């Protein structure tokens, strides 16, 4: 765990302090009675965002539920190949509220979600390297409501669209006694 | 495009394979070929080994028939939506909005895709507006006047009654609109002629 | 007692028919989404150990199928509300000055002066609802769901019905409610000629929803 | 080997009630994409699916994992008894309401909607004329007047 100092007041005697969960979140010093916070320590997945391989082979990590901090102790930078070094350290390393995103350039514009991140960001990659943004959320528009306005169609489009519904499965069936036994 | 039928016959044959996989799993047993426990080991022992595999492989397999037990529903919903479809773009014309397409509903073909079926929804979408002024009533003879199947359009100088989804201005008359009230209740209400089709014809005849 | 005892006079030659009318708001609730929730069966099951592990490799993957279907999970928690709520292209804005013949929607949609873009309801909703685990966050923000609601809003008080099955055509509100009550049976000139109680009930009955929620828990 | 069984078992069933509840969920969502498709995007003729009543207008709000509707109806109020008649019998022909129903205070007869009383005066704008009166049970005598 990660020990810091806690604000909490335990009791005089009371040496441990749990959560709902039954879990340590306070712990008292045995010698100076000093009574400090147990904070798990970091840990989350890691994703990597990368367009097809058909269309190019750069790539840009996620970790979530990290401030940006620890990643380069949490990684293991110097045990792995260098190529994973890469992605432990650089200059785009953007926070968001999923996590850290090491490998995407942040930028201050918004498109149409291309590859879901989280917390509203989405990445994706054009002029060439990847880039992470906040999505907006089709065009903007204002009617032009007045009180004695209408808009009234003169020309019209005959339009046909494609739905696909699924409507049944393999009807698969299995035998358990020759499954687990076969001929035994 | 067929990302759903493909989503399900994937999902289908993964996990029919993870199954089979687990058949290839000790569960903490000292082999996982039941004949190789048995040809190695004395009854005594070779029991509690081919017990334990057993255990491992029924959990295994009960887990795969929860997890289709659980898609069957899913399917099962979609199908009946399908069904549903069917029934009211197929067989007939739906007032469901986003029901049949994004849309006025005209009509639907169905055609059939392995493990599923595709519809194609064909629908009627307004093309070019123009903006004009309009008013909720009309005032004729101190009497209240309003459309019976229309909206009362102006080109900017002529008033004119026009259906709602598609511009068909005509000359506003008795026949295409309804009195009720005066012309003062009416909020909005403007000023123009109600052409009576008989008094013309009177004057003539 | 399942309810009142009533009994209709019904006859051969007799009808009743309504002489005024009361305009009804009423609310709907629907639950949307889920936590997405996604647990790591190691270090749930084994943890620190790494004996376990090696032990826990003869399960087979059990811990692919957990996770495998765990993320399925948060991946449709958010394909629902992209379809409950993503079902505008464009997002359509209330026009600057609110002057709608006399139906106040002031109660219903954004004020700026809050800091999220979120109406009186909405903020009364939101104050009112109070080891290997991770709960993901949502892909779509709480102001991102606002804004889709904001723009339906605006799409329907603006332009009716006509922008969700095509091009957004501006109508006059006090119509487009007379087009609605065309459709229920009820010729439009009864709107017309009694636009100012029928906004009125509507305006209070807009009200009343905020203190039929606040008050009532359950 | 039983700390591990037993809590891979926990985990399972945790799992399990998990996808049960989400698919009790992803139903919800439908439901509610359609209410806010038929409710919100349009005027829905099916009855009590927007509100009880007759479905006017709809208004989405959002909510923590969720979605308000406040539903807009128009519920007749107000009611009174009145007299009806399949039909009127003016010069030996049927006649019927074309958009109404005819309903008598006691002296004159008038065509009025199904749902709101407005009466007029029945006119040969306001019905339409079938056959003779010698079929409708119950049709009654009555003036059709023409404004021509």
């Given at each position: 765990?990660?020990?810091?100092?806690?604000?909490?007041?335990?009791?005089?005697?009371?040496?441990?302090?749990?959560?709902?969960?039954?879990?340590?979140?306070?712990?008292?010093?045995?010698?100076?009675?000093?009574?400090?916070?147990?904070?798990?320590?970091?840990?989350?997945?890691?994703?990597?965002?990368?367009?097809?391989?058909?269309?190019?082979?750069?790539?840009?990590?996620?970790?979530?539920?990290?401030?940006?901090?620890?990643?380069?102790?949490?990684?293991?930078?110097?045990?792995?190949?260098?190529?994973?070094?890469?992605?432990?350290?650089?200059?785009?390393?953007?926070?968001?509220?999923?996590?850290?995103?090491?490998?995407?350039?942040?930028?201050?514009?918004?498109?149409?979600?291309?590859?879901?991140?989280?917390?509203?960001?989405?990445?994706?990659?054009?002029?060439?390297?990847?880039?992470?943004?906040?999505?907006?959320?089709?065009?903007?528009?204002?009617?032009?409501?007045?009180?004695?306005?209408?808009?009234?169609?003169?020309?019209?489009?005959?339009?046909?669209?494609?739905?696909?519904?699924?409507?049944?499965?393999?009807?698969?069936?299995?035998?358990?006694?020759?499954?687990?036994?076969?001929?035994? | 495009?067929?990302?759903?039928?493909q989503d399900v016959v994937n999902q289908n044959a993964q996990a029919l394979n993870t199954l089979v996989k687990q058949l290839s799993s000790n569960f903490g047993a000292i082999s996982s070929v039941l004949n190789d426990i048995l040809s190695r080991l004395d009854p005594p022992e070779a029991e509690?080994?081919?017990?334990?595999?057993?255990?491992?492989?029924?959990?295994?397999?009960?887990?795969?028939?929860?997890?289709?037990?659980?898609?069957?529903?899913?399917?099962?919903?979609?199908?009946?939506?399908?069904?549903?479809?069917?029934?009211?773009?197929?067989?007939?014309?739906?007032?469901?909005?986003?029901?049949?397409?994004?849309?006025?509903?005209?009509?639907?073909?169905?055609?059939?895709?392995?493990?599923?079926?595709?519809?194609?929804?064909?629908?009627?979408?307004?093309?070019?507006?123009?903006?004009?002024?309009?008013?909720?009533?009309?005032?004729?003879?101190?009497?209240?006047?309003?459309?019976?199947?229309?909206?009362?359009?102006?080109?900017?100088?002529?008033?004119?009654?026009?259906?709602?989804?598609?511009?068909?201005?005509?000359?506003?008359?008795?026949?295409?609109?309804?009195?009720?009230?005066?012309?003062?209740?009416?909020?909005?209400?403007?000023?123009?002629?109600?052409?009576?089709?008989?008094?013309?014809?009177?004057?003539?005849? | 007692?399942?309810?009142?005892?009533?009994?209709?006079?019904?006859?051969?030659?007799?009808?009743?028919?309504?002489?005024?009318?009361?305009?009804?708001?009423?609310?709907?609730?629907?639950?949307?989404?889920?936590?997405?929730?996604?647990?790591?069966?190691?270090?749930?099951?084994?943890?620190?150990?790494?004996?376990?592990?090696?032990?826990?490799?003869?399960?087979?993957?059990?811990?692919?199928?957990?996770?495998?279907?765990?993320?399925?999970?948060?991946?449709?928690?958010?394909?629902?509300?992209?379809?409950?709520?993503?079902?505008?292209?464009?997002?359509?804005?209330?026009?600057?000055?609110?002057?709608?013949?006399?139906?106040?929607?002031?109660?219903?949609?954004?004020?700026?002066?809050?800091?999220?873009?979120?109406?009186?309801?909405?903020?009364?909703?939101?104050?009112?609802?109070?080891?290997?685990?991770?709960?993901?966050?949502?892909?779509?923000?709480?102001?991102?769901?606002?804004?889709?609601?904001?723009?339906?809003?605006?799409?329907?008080?603006?332009?009716?019905?006509?922008?969700?099955?095509?091009?957004?055509?501006?109508?006059?509100?006090?119509?487009?409610?007379?087009?609605?009550?065309?459709?229920?049976?009820?010729?439009?000139?009864?709107?017309?000629?009694?636009?100012?109680?029928?906004?009125?009930?509507?305006?209070?009955?807009?009200?009343?929803?905020?203190?039929?929620?606040?008050?009532?828990?359950?």
């Open positions: 765990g990660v020990l810091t100092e806690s604000n909490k007041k335990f009791l005089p005697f009371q040496q441990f302090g749990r959560d709902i969960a039954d879990t340590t979140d306070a712990v008292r010093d045995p010698q100076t009675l000093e009574i400090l916070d147990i904070t798990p320590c970091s840990f989350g997945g890691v994703s990597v965002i990368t367009p097809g391989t058909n269309t190019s082979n750069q790539v840009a990590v996620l970790y979530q539920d990290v401030n940006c901090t620890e990643v380069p102790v949490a990684i293991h930078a110097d045990q792995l190949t260098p190529t994973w070094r890469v992605y432990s350290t650089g200059s785009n390393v953007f926070q968001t509220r999923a996590g850290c995103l090491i490998g995407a350039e942040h930028v201050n514009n918004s498109y149409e979600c291309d590859i879901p991140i989280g917390a509203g960001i989405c990445a994706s990659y054009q002029t060439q390297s990847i880039i992470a943004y906040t999505m907006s959320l089709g065009a903007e528009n204002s009617v032009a409501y007045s009180n004695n306005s209408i808009a009234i169609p003169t020309n019209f489009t005959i339009s046909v669209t494609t739905e696909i519904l699924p409507v049944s499965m393999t009807k698969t069936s299995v035998d358990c006694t020759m499954y687990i036994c076969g001929d035994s | 495009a067929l990302g759903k039928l509690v080994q081919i017990d334990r595999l057993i255990t491992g492989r029924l959990q295994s397999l009960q887990t795969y028939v929860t997890q289709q037990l659980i898609r069957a529903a899913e399917i099962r919903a979609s199908a009946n939506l399908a069904a549903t479809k069917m029934s009211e773009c197929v067989l007939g014309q739906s007032k469901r909005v986003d029901f049949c397409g994004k849309g006025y509903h005209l009509m639907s073909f169905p055609q059939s895709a392995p493990h599923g079926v595709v519809f194609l929804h064909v629908t009627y979408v307004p093309a070019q507006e123009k903006n004009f002024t309009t008013a909720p009533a009309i005032c004729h003879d101190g009497k209240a006047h309003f459309p019976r199947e229309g909206v009362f359009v102006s080109n900017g100088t002529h008033w004119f009654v026009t259906q709602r989804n598609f511009y068909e201005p005509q000359i506003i008359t008795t026949d295409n609109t309804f009195v009720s009230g005066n012309c003062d209740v009416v909020i909005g209400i403007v000023n123009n002629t109600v052409y009576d089709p008989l008094q013309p014809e009177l004057d003539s005849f | 007692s399942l309810g009142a005892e009533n009994s209709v006079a019904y006859s051969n030659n007799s009808i009743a028919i309504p002489t005024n009318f009361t305009i009804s708001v009423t609310t709907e609730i629907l639950p949307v989404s889920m936590t997405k929730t996604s647990v790591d069966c190691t270090m749930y099951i084994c943890g620190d150990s790494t004996e376990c592990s090696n032990l826990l490799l003869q399960y087979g993957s059990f811990c692919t199928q957990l996770n495998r279907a765990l993320t399925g999970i948060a991946v449709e928690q958010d394909k629902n509300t992209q379809e409950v709520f993503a079902q505008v292209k464009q997002i359509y804005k209330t026009p600057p000055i609110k002057d709608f013949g006399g139906f106040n929607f002031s109660q219903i949609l954004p004020d700026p002066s809050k800091p999220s873009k979120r109406s009186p309801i909405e903020d009364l909703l939101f104050n009112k609802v109070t080891n290997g685990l991770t709960v993901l966050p949502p892909l779509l923000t709480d102001e991102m769901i606002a804004q889709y609601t904001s723009a339906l809003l605006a799409g329907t008080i603006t332009s009716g019905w006509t922008f969700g099955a095509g091009p957004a055509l501006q109508i006059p509100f006090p119509m487009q409610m007379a087009y609605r009550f065309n459709g229920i049976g009820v010729t439009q000139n009864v709107l017309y000629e009694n636009q100012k109680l029928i906004a009125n009930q509507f305006n209070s009955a807009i009200g009343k929803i905020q203190d039929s929620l606040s008050s009532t828990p359950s």
